[model samples]
Target chain A: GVDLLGFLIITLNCNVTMVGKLWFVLTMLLRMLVIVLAGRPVYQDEQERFVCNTLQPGCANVCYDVFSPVSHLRFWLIQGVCVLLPSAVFSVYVLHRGATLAALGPGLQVPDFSAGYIIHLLLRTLLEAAFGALHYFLFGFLAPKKFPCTRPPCTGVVDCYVSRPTEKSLLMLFLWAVSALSFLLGLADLVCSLRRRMRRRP
Target chain B: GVDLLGFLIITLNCNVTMVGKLWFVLTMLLRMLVIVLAGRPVYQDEQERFVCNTLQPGCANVCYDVFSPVSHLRFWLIQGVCVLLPSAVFSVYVLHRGATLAALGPGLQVPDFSAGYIIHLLLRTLLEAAFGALHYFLFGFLAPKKFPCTRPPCTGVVDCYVSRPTEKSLLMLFLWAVSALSFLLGLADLVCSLRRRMRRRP
Candidate 1:
């Protein structure tokens, strides 16, 4: 039988191995939930109508452009997808190795303690943290409620507002929280593993 | 013997160990050079006088505030210092370990091939890459040449300019290039180490 527990502990602490696994699965679910249910509405409002005095076709649009240098929905969704990349890579490696093990001998199990497996998990954790940090740096945790938008043809100094800014900001922060939890779990696992190795050597 | 070469190879590929050590030293020197010589001039120009139609005390200043959401020089200097954090941490670890080895035995050498050393180096590379990516995502590699700044009490729609924007942007890009090279060297070392481990096991 395949040792799924071995795989779980390879990426997190032994005590909270199941929590680590659930965190990974739940993060994906939360991201998908955001994409399916909560997604596109904020952007949809921006697309529909921009509040501007000018009746000129392009003026309000230009102001809207300034207001939204980057779309909140799009960036969050990108974060969702990119965060999964490392997990996908790890899963592929595990799958390949498992198959190789089966081919060699039916009774033999996938070696979770190997340097290769440890390195793979370490890289995965590193990548997930990298993705989380990158998103934090780029979009920030909070979506801006108001931003200045002044362009030609749009009557003097107009401030643009996003629909449901507070709600959207909170939602983005929730995603960040989940990403942080995953990073922490992986980090704890690394620390624990390192400690065990150190103790054994000493 | 201190085995300085061993310390260098622990963080980079064996063939390019000296290059890795030099890269670390050079990056720090370059950062200091930027801080001392080329630093502050761009920001000094902004502080000197902001070009604006309105002579009001706060008007030009407000416009300048809008133009510069974040100061380029301050952010770059922060990057310069923060990038050294992982290296500093690694250096401290090595110093402590070296002393511990001396305490144990006079001839005992610092074990650079230990899992602890490898883990530390891996963490260092990861942190350096994280810093590089964070800076990239936040400030971006190139400083913006011109940005629109239209806050009231001054003129209508004033676009603010930075002094020597192209030069500043190129300098920032050059820093990015150095960070990238350092990251690549560390990554190459990790891959080579992994390959060696796999071959030995097989």
Candidate 2:
């Protein structure tokens, strides 16, 4: 019974490359633990700032108790504003990149497979930049001293939390707009599925 | 250029009925404002229990000051436990049900689908049951009076947080395992995609 059910769920959840980014999804979970266990932070930024709780949900340097309220607050704040969103955006890039590379294979040089391929490439890339900017604003506002980023008119990735309330709000609006747009796409797909199910069956 | 790119992103995100439950996702968002804005409170069960923001974070009951530490802690707790996850579980069920009903069409009476279709139908159905059970355990342990639910030998849904740590941990493990397993299927799909791409192109 378990075997049959397991096989069936596997098929349904991640069977073939339908519309889900299965690997990307897995990477989101795996990367958290992977990053935590590996302790190998991805980019080696030489800025005079440091980061913590890159993956785990706890206090950075000074958390003592297991269920410390401060730790929990810090964990969630970083998890959303810092880790998860960044990871989600990065996932799209990786998904596209993996596909691009696999398409090319061996000798290198990716292709113009479809309009879908190039379009997502650009969108997620822009979204990542948008989120990155948004993060700068959020962190700046939420914790100006604790987790700081560089100053703005942001030239590049700032290390300190640079406070700009108006800019933060604007960036957040941008992030929300794009994210919502993605959801609308998901709704349209739902409609498509309904139409497809009936037609395909009949 | 930005708008055109935005258009393309929306299309690609949910361009099909393959995977990724988009509407369920929007609910994850919609429910928040729904919870906040409407204030109609979806369900009304007047149990003699007082609850705190342990799992549902944000704007705790009339905190006058800006930096309410208690509110922040409660926000993080509930956010991860309450608002986000329950919505996610319910999302899968809604996605499946909507599809199931739609498949039957205007003439009414739902029935008949492939082995694959029903398998997912059953699995998510079961998984939701499991998560509901899991939630019962979690809330019970965290907030005994607040989130009391149906007693386990759990015949059905109980309403309120009651504390039971051991069962909660085990149930959480079950939830994570299945969720991870789904992602693993994603990995399998990725491999399949790579193979397919290589074969198709070259």
Candidate 3:
């Protein structure tokens, strides 16, 4: 009974959200049907009856025994080791961070920089903005092909076939282009930073 | 560079705990390899060179795009909606209950004798314990099934039969099991509570 209940519960929880609550109701009904079916007489023929009684019992017993204790133990251990441990660690970290942050001096004031500092900030901001726009152009227009069509109609026929892009996939494509651009910008930033440092040295 | 840095940090955090780090690393590396391979030139044929170049660019574009902001955003959004929301709600409920208990006047601590409370706690505890056990059992027994069998005479037949379970399918199974169990326990609790209320009325 405990095993049955556990199995039922686990099945319900795992699938309910994605599949729907009706599945749980259907599954329960199905289980009850199985129980009824198993209890019924197998055949009118004595030979078939004997085989059904003998083989069915053995099969049922084997299935139940295999699924019962081992599955229960497996479920418990997995929940503890995989799900709980990392979650516990994350929880602890969050709590620790929150507490530490709360302990910071309440009246601490943030500094505001004057015109020179603002100009420096503005220049840095413009540089990043310019780099970002340029990076987009470089990667979006200049970068080499990345994703190839491997599916049917695309295989060995077309070099590249443009299809209606999914909203999800399109966003991904944009991001990839952005990232390539960012890489190019990073190289540029490295050069600029080095040049600034060299000028400061004299 | 920021994305790479972020990835490195996450990888480091994941590796901090020794368990499953190798599998995680391998999965990530394989995915990265796939991304790289998918972006590269398709063929050496001169006749197909133009098509390859044309298609390859789009393919590479997709690979970079999907992995970046677009896919990342979708991943986070789905994760937040599906997993994080429920987890947060559950955590809040647990914390609130605990806090209420802590707020009780000193020396006036009372044992929680509420039937509904006890049942709810028992259900969650039992579900968790059951889930952990099942997870262990699955890994122990099913992990072997994931590898192709290569014993002497049976090698060909067994190797042909054995196929590794997809991660998505395995996760779906696990979640379904958990959901089912939770739902059953909840139903049982509801029934028990209703029965208790009826008895009280009488």
Interface RMSD for every prediction, one decimal? 17.4, 18.9, 24.9
User: Per-residue lDDT tens digits of candidate 2, residues A90-192?
Assistant: 3344343332233222432323223343344344335445554654554433322334322222233323222333443453354345444544443343445
What would the DockQ be for model 1? 0.02
Off by over 4 Å in 1: A1-19, A106-110, A128-134, A153-155, A198-202, B1-202
Best of the two (1, 3) by lDDT = 1
True contacts kept of 2: 0.00
lDDT of 1 by residue, A6-84 (tens): 3333333322345457767777676657664666444445534445544533454456545655554544554555455
Question: Over all chains combined, what TM-score does candidate 2 have?
Answer: 0.25
Candidate 2 residues B150-177, lDDT tens each? 3233244323322222322333343345
User: Model 2, stretches more than 4 Å misplaced?
Assistant: A1-112, A141-202, B1-17, B20-113, B133-202
Cα RMSD (angstroms) for every candidate in the order listed:
16.6, 21.2, 26.6
lDDT tens digits by residue: candidate 3, A1-202: 1122222222222211221122222222322222222111111111221111122224423333322223212222332233223323433544454345434534112221122222332343344455446435443332222123223321231232222124323433543453344334334533554455457555
The global C-alpha lDDT for each of the candidates, from Candidate 1 onward, is: 0.55, 0.33, 0.31
The TM-scores, one per candidate, come to 0.43, 0.25, 0.22
